[PDB]
Design a protein around this nucleic acid. Sequence first.
RNA 1: GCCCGGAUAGCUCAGUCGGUAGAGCAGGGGAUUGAAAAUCCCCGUGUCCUUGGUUCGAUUCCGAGUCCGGGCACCA
RNA 2: AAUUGAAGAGUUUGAUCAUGGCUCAGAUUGAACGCUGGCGGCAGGCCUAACACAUGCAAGUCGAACGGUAACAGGAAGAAGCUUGCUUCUUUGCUGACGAGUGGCGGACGGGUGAGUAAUGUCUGGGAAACUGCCUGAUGGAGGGGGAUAACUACUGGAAACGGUAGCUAAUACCGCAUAACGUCGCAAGACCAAAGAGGGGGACCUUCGGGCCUCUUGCCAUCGGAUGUGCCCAGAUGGGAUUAGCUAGUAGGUGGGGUAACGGCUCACCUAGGCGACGAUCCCUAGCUGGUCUGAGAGGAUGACCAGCCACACUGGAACUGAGACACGGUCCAGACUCCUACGGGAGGCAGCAGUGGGGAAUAUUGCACAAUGGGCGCAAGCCUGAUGCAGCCAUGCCGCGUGUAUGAAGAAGGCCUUCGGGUUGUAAAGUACUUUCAGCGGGGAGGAAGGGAGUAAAGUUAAUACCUUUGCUCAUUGACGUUACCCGCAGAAGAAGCACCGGCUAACUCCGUGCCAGCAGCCGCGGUAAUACGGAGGGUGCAAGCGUUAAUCGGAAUUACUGGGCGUAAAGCGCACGCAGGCGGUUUGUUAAGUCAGAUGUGAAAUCCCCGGGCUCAACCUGGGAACUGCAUCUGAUACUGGCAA
Lengths: 205, 85, 61, 82, 392
Amino acid sequence: ARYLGPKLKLSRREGTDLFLKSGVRAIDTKCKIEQAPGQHGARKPRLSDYGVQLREKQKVRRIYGVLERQFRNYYKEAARLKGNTGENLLALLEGRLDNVVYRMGFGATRAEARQLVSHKAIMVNGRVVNIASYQVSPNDVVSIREKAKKQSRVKAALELAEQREKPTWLEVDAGKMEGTFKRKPERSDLSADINEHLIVELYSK
Amino acid sequence: NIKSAKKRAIQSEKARKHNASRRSMMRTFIKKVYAAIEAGDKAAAQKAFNEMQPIVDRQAAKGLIHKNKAARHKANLTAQINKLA
Amino acid sequence: TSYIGGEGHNLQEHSVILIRGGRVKDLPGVRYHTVRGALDCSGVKDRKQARSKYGVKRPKA
Amino acid sequence: MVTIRLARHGAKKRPFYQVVVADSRNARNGRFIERVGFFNPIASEKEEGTRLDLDRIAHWVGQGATISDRVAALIKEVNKAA
Amino acid sequence: SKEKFERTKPHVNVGTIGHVDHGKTTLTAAITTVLAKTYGGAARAFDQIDNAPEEKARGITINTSHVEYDTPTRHYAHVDCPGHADYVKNMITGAAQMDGAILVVAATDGPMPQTREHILLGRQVGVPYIIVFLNKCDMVDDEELLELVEMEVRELLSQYDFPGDDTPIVRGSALKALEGDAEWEAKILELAGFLDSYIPEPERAIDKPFLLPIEDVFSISGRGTVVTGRVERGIIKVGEEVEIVGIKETQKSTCTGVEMFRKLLDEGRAGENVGVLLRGIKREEIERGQVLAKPGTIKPHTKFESEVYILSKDEGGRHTPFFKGYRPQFYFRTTDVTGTIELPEGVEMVMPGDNIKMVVTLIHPIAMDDGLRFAIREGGRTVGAGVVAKVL
RNA sequence: GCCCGGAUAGCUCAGUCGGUAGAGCAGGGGAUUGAAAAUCCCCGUGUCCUUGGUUCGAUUCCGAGUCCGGGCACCA
RNA sequence: AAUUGAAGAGUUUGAUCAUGGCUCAGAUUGAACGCUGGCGGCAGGCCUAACACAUGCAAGUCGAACGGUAACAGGAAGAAGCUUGCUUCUUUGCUGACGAGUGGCGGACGGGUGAGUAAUGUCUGGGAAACUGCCUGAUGGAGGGGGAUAACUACUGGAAACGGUAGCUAAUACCGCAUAACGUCGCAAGACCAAAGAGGGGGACCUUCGGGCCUCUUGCCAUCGGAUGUGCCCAGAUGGGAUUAGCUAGUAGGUGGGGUAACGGCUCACCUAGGCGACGAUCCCUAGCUGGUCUGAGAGGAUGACCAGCCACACUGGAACUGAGACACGGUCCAGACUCCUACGGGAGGCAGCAGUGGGGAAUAUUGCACAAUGGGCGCAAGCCUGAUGCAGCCAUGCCGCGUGUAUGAAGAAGGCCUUCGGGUUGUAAAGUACUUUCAGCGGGGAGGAAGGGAGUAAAGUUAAUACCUUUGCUCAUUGACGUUACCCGCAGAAGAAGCACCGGCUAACUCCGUGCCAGCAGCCGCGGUAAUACGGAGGGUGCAAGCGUUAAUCGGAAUUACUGGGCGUAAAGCGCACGCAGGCGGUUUGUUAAGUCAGAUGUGAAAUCCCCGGGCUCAACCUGGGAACUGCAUCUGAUACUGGCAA
Ligand SMILES: Nc1nc2c(ncn2[C@@H]2O[C@H](COP(=O)(O)OP(=O)(O)OP(=O)(O)O)[C@@H](O)[C@H]2O)c(=O)[nH]1
Ligand SMILES: *C(=O)[C@@H](N)Cc1ccccc1
C-alpha cells in the first residue's frame, strides 16, 4: 500500500518539496531537485489540461501516501458531507492518525510516523490504535505507550518538532510525550501552498 | 419409502374404509328422500326426511362434514317438501 | 474464423483452444482472437513485455 | 399460534436479536406482524443494550400471544420494578 | 464400504508368476477353496479372478485380480498376474506388491523362457523368496521324469543366485484341487503349510518420509477417482494433505479414503496393499505411471547412471550387439518410458551377456532414487536387467 | 490396460509383397520499378515420426515406443 | 439535519461549417481467462443439463393414553459356590426406563430449484357471499353401556418384497343410549345433534383388600368471540410482434336442481342470442413477480444472484384419499420412460434437501463439527429429533483495513543505459550503520456469546393440609460446536512477503539497438517500404497494487428514440390531393354539479436496502437506534379561478 521505493524521487517529478525526507537535516540539497525529474528531466513537459489537474491530485496523495482506492473512498465521504466538498476533503485528509501524530512532532515525517502507528506505539484515549485510517474526532487526547516510550527514536523526532510551524487546531505537551486534538482543521490554518480546487474537478468526469 | 412415517399410509387405508363406508350410507338416505319427492307423497317424504336428519347431524359433529354442507342438505331438501305441498 | 495472436504458434488441425472476442480490422469476417496462454495452444516464446497476453510466465531465473 | 419470538440478525460471531411478534409457522427471519424492539447481548456499558415495548407485548398476549422463555427472561430482565 | 480391517494376523502381500496356461488363475482359485474349509471367507472361483470381457474372450488373465486369505498363524494377500509378453505391463504391477512370489510351474513342460522372464523381473523387482508349485502333475505320473523336471527348476534358481535346492518343492493339481480331489487339495494344504515356513516378515519403515507408487487407476461412482498401490515408506491418515509426482507437473490433493479389499481402514502404513482417494480429480488428470509423495520433498529429475546385465537370445534378450542411438523401453514399476542410451567410452558393441554400465537420460521427468533395481525391454521382449548406479 | 487408422519434404497423396524416393499446389532467389502485378532468368528444400531385428540391402518384412483420432472395458 | 447537482476527445474534406453514424476515456457484475500472489474481517460462490445418480444424513416424538417388555439396569423370591449372605443365578412387568404394535400430534412449517405461466399469477387499493388445529377470552356440560382389531401365540404362501387362515385383550381408536342450549333447519310450532379420561399427593371415612373418596395440574365436547393463517371477487398496473384480424358455442346471460367451507357455468337440464375486439381480443415468441441492485443530473433505461414476501413444481403426465389445512419433495394408486434385484413367477427407486459423482460447461466449494446459541416438532418436564441455524474447510469472486519497515547514507561506487564520449542517468537507490517489530512463526495467560435447566431450601398462595403443585428469591455443581479462539503479554530477527498493464494523439509516461509492408501491433485515427517515440528486446519512466490487464455483459457519454430534451425546402424525413367517422382540441356570457384539479385530514404504502443525525466492532468494510423517505393509491370534508358535463 505504501510507495516503499524511491521516497524522494516523488518530489523531483513535481518540482517542489513534499517533506518525505525532512529529517534531522535542515535543507536537503543533495537531491538534484527541479533540474531532473528523471532521465529526460531537462525536457519541457507539454502539460495538458487533464495532466495538470492530475499532477495536482497526485501531489496531495504523495503527501499522505494514501492510494487511489482509499482516496476515492475519501472523496465520496466528502461528497456526502454538506457545505463545500473541496474544503471537506482537506479536513478528512488531515484527520488520519499518522498525520495527527506528525503534527504533534512525535513522528519525524509521515513515513516515520506510520511506523509508530502500525507498531502499536500510539495510544489515544487509553486505546491503542494500529490503523492509520483512524479519523480523529474533536476533543480527544493522544499519547505513547510506556514501553514504546523514549526508545531512542521518538526523542530525536521531538527535536525536529521545534523547527516546524506547529498547527493551531490541536495541541501537544512534549514534556510527558502527550498531545491533544482541540478542533478540526480550518482551510486558513493549513499549508496554503497546496491546491485542492482542481482535485474536485478531476473526479467529476 | 424408508421413513417411519409410513404409518400414516396404512392408517389412512384403515381410515378410508371407515370414512367411505359411512359417507355412502349417508348418501343413500339422501337418495331415499328424493324418491318420495319423485313419487309425490309428502307423508312418505316427511318420514324419510325426519330419519335421515339425526344421521347427517351426527356425521358433521364427528368431523366428516364441514357443517355448512350438512346444513344445506337439510335446507334445500326442506325446500322440496314445501314446493311438494 | 479466428485470429491467431502473437509471434509463432503450433496449431495443426486440432489441439483444443480457447476463443475470446476482438475485431482486428484487417481481415474481414474475423472477430475472434485465440486465447494464448490457455489450453493446448501454448504461449509464445521469449516475450518479456505484456506477458499477461500470450501466456508467458515470470522468468524462473 | 401467534408468538413473540426472536430473530437472529447481524454479523457472524457478532449476534443481534430482534424481538418480534410473528406467526409460529413462519421462518426465523421470515414474515411477521411487527417488531417490538431489539436485543443486544453483545453490548457494553454504553447506555443501551435493550429496548422492549412492554406495552405492545401485552397487547398481543391478550389476543393470545405465547412468549418464548428466552424473551420472557428478557421481560424479567427489563424488570417491572426498575 | 464397511468392515474395518482387523490386525489379528501377521499380514503378508504375496502373488503368483509363471507362464501362460500354467494355471496361475486356476491355482489362485484352487487356493481359496482349500482355505475355505478352514476359514470360509474367500471361496474364490476362476471367474472371480478373470472379471474382464477380454479375459473371458480368450480364457486368460490380463488384469491383476486381488484376493486374500489367512492361515491360523498369518494373513496373506495374493495377486494373480497376467502371463503374456504383451501383458508384462500388468505383470510388473503385481510383481511390485510381492514380498514373495509363487512359481506356477507345470511339470509337463517346466522351464519355458517366458517362465524364466517372470523370475528375471522378480529378481530385478526384489523378490527374496519364491515357493515353487509343481503344477499339472495330475497328467504327468512318470515320477522318474517328475524328478528330472524338478532338477531343472532347482538349477535355474541356482544360476540366478537363488537357493533352488533349498526351495520347497510343492507338487499339485490346480484343477482337481479346485473341484475337490482331497489328495491334490492336500497339496494346496502343503502349499499353505510351506507358505508359513518359507516366508519371513518383511520390515516396513513407516517412520520415513511418505512415498507411494501408482499401481492402478479407478473411478468409483459418487466418490471420484481413487488410486491404488502399496505404500513404500511413511504413513497416511484420512485428511492428510499430500502431493503427486508424475510425468508432468506436481499436483496437490488431500486423502479422503483409506481402504483394503473393499473394506475400510483408518490409517495407512508402509507395505500394506491399500489405496488413497484424491480430492476432486478427473480420470484424465491421473493415469498409470505417477507416484504419490510427502509435500515438498521430491523434484522430478531427468538423468541418472546405471549398470546392467544384458540377456542373450537364448536367455530372452538379443543376439545382435547394438550401438549408440538404440532406444529400448526402460521399465520401472509403473512405466514403459523410452529413453536414449548415452554409453561410456570404450564399448561400441554391447554383446548379449554384458555386465556393463551406462548413463540414462529419459524423455519424461520422473521421481527416482539411488539403488533402484529395474529392467529394460524392447520389441515385446526383455533386453536388460539393470540397477540404478547413481542419479544425476 | 488392450484392439486399429493416420505419423511421407510448407501442405495433400502415389510409389512396397527389399534395390540409393516422385508429382502437384506452393513458395522463394535474381533483372525492371518509388515499391509491385506482369515479363524475362532458375528452380526440390526430403530425419519416408523415433529405435532395433531377419540384412550385400527395409518407404515397403517383424515388431516395440511416442503423438493424434476412434471403440471396449476394468470400478478401492 | 433528510437527492449542493449535468465535462469531452478522434474519424468523412485540399481546407471549413453543419448533418450523421462509428470509436474511446467512467462505473458496475453471481464473472471467466492470462500472470502474480502475505495476512485478516465481512459477504458471495452450478448463470449451462428442471441432465442422470452410489452411499451417509435431511422428521420424528409422547409410558403424564393403552395392551404389553423381546432386550438393559434394579427390586423381590429363590438358587449354588462356599469368604453362611461373599457370589453365582432360574423366574417375576412389581418399578426405572423401553425395541415392535394400537392411538394422539407433527409430517402442508422449515429447505431447494425457476421448468412452466403474459394473467387463473404478482403488485397497488378495496370488497363480501367464508373458514380458521395449536394459543387466548366468556358461559355450560363432562351420565350410563356395547362390539372388534394390531401387537402377541399356532400354522402357513413367497427368494425377497409382502402377506394369508383361525383365535386372545385394552384405551384419549370406533360405534350407541341419555341430556341438550342465545347451536342447526324452518315464518313459527316443533324436530335434531356432543364428549375421554388419565397424572401427583393425601386426612377422616372407606377398603369384593383393584380401589373408591378429597384435592391440585392437564386434557375432552358444544357455542359466540379474538388473533393468525387460508380460500374467493372487482378495478388499475404488470413484455416484444399487426408480415396474427376476427375470436368464442358451456361460450354471454337468465331460471331450477346438484355441488363447493364460501360465490359463480364450477358443473348439468330448458330458454334467450348474444359476449369480447383497435384505449390491441385470439395467435406466435420470450419471461417467474414485487420489494430492490446497477447505472444516470433527474426523468428514465437495464436488471430481478444473495437477503425477504408471494406464486408454481417435485423423474414425465394424471387422479384421489387422509386431514383443520396438501388435491402433498424425504405419502398413496395407475400409466410411461430410465436404472436395479431376481430363486425369472414377481418386486424395489426418484439428491431441482446438506454434502458428493459422472457428464455438460469458459466457470462456481467438504461425502466436516454441534444441537452450546436462535427458531421449529412432540412431550408436564427432564429431554429427544433438528444438513433450518450456528460454525469450520476451499476459492483473491467482491468490499474495506493492514504488511512487505523507519532513519541515516556521497567515493555522489559497481554494473546496466544513453552520450556533444565533457558527462548525464539508474540514484538515498544499495552497501555499511543505528533503531523497530505490525502481521505471520513459537510459547503462556485469557473474555464474551449463558438465557436457563436440574437437586436442595425459605416464604407467600391453592387446599382438610405445614403435603402435592405454582410463582418470586437464594445456594451448590455446572451446560461452549467454534477454539491450538477475540484480545493482552513475551521471545528470535530486516528476519518470512511486489508484482501488472502502459509510454504516436486520444490519455498521465522515452531514447537506443535489432527486424525492414518481413515479423507482428490494433479500441479509433492507424503504424511498419533500411534513421520506427506505435513491431520485439534493453534501460528509464507512468498508472495501479495483492492485485494488474484481457474478454463478455449493462447503463452512461448518445439531445445518435429527444416526456424533461430532437427534426422534416435543399442533409434521412410532407401522404399526389381532398372528404370525413372514431379520436384529439375548441370563441365568448351567466348559473350550476364539483368529476379533473388543489388544500388538509385519515388508512395504507411490510421489514431490510437507498438518504440524514448518532452508537458499537483498535478504524473501515459490516452490524445497529431514531427519523426521514417510500415521489404511489383509496376514502372523507372543503376551495371554484382554470379544463370538462347539463341548461338558457
Ligand atoms: N489337468 C489340469 N489342468 C490344469 C491345471 N492347472 C491349470 N490347468 C488348466 O490350464 C488352464 C490355464 O488357464 P489359466 O489358469 O488362465 O492359466 P495361467 O497360468 O493363469 O495363464 P495366464 O492367464 O496367461 O496368466 C486352465 O484352463 C486349466 O483348465 C492342473 O493342475 N491340472
Ligand atoms: C482395494 O481393495 C485394494 N486394497 C486391493 C485391490 C483390489 C482390486 C484391484 C486393485 C486393488
